[PDB]
Ligand binder design. Structure first.
Ligand SMILES: Nc1nc2ncc(COP(=O)(O)O)nc2c(=O)[nH]1
Length: 279
């Protein structure tokens, strides 16, 4: 198959535009084949987010054919964003945050990432508590609280794929994301990573968030590596750590990774693929 695509993260901060246009150039030049544009943080939020991501999207589109993803769970944002050059929606609520999202994706003929969101699925699980609240969903949710992570993931996905099926999004336009880092424990995070092929067995490409996740940070810390992001040493170790997950991921054929440091992950992707595609 084709080697792992690197998706570089561009978070527009609430000039902000010239700064996002600058990061894009940088990531492209580092070998990003896709960029993920986010503008998060009511009609007031929908409008402010749109006025964040839309100008950025247009400007990238003026100079580049790079695949652009809109990181939004709000259908009004993804709609403005596709109308401007975006190719796909990265939905961190996996179609559960907005009932009209499926239609917006279906209507635009777009690709979509359906992330498993365990924070929505288990709002009171101790790991979820620190997370904000996603969505404008689930019933009396009482089974969820209790399921193993992989049966849990499955149930969320069952729901969300049905939502997509009814909107008529072509099955070949869907990418699944296990939701690593989101109200999952260390062990659940690692188990889901250990079992990426089970998720491949379902038949969809896998979009993976491998970058600067607290569980990898803590493996570094417990093991004598400096992890303070405000040091050169700590900053680099954190990005190298992630590149290692990309190495493992790209080797088993994960289709996309979503990442901060494109260059360290391009080194992982090249080594892992050369091995994978040996013959
Ligand atoms: N699909 C997907 N989307 C995401 N959006 C944001 C963040 C966390 O923050 P960031 O914006 O700095 O990456 N992580 C993910 C992830 O793992 N997967």
């Amino acid at each position: 198959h084709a080697k792992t695509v690197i998706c570089g993260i561009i978070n527009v901060t609430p000039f902000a535009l010239e700064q996002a246009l600058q990061q894009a150039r940088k990531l492209i030049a580092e070998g990003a084949s896709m960029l993920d544009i986010g503008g998060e943080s009511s009609y007031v939020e929908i409008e402010e987010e749109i006025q964040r991501v839309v100008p950025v999207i247009k400007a990238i589109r003026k100079e580049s054919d790079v695949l652009i993803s809109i990181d939004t769970w709000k259908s009004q944002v993804a709609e403005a964003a596709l109308a401007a050059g975006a190719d796909l929606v990265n939905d961190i609520t996996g179609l559960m945050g907005d009932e009209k999202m499926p239609h917006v994706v279906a209507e635009a003929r777009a690709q979509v990432v359906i992330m498993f969101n365990p924070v929505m699925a288990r709002p009171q699980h101790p790991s979820s508590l620190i997370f904000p609240h996603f969505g404008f969903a689930f019933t009396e949710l009482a089974d969820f609280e209790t399921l193993p992570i992989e049966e849990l993931m499955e149930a969320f996905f069952e729901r969300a794929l049905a939502r997509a099926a009814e909107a008529g999004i072509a099955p070949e336009n869907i990418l699944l994301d296990p939701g690593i880092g989101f109200g999952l424990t260390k062990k659940e995070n690692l188990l889901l990573l250990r079992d990426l092929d089970k998720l491949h067995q379902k038949g969809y490409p896998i979009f993976l968030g491998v970058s600067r996740k607290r569980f990898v940070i803590n493996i570094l810390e417990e093991n004598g590596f400096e992890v303070n992001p405000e040091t050169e040493l700590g900053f680099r170790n954190r990005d190298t750590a992630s590149a290692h997950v990309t190495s493992i991921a790209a080797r088993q054929g994960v289709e996309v990774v979503r990442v901060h440091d494109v260059a360290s992950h391009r080194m992982a992707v090249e080594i892992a693929s050369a091995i994978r595609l040996a013959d």
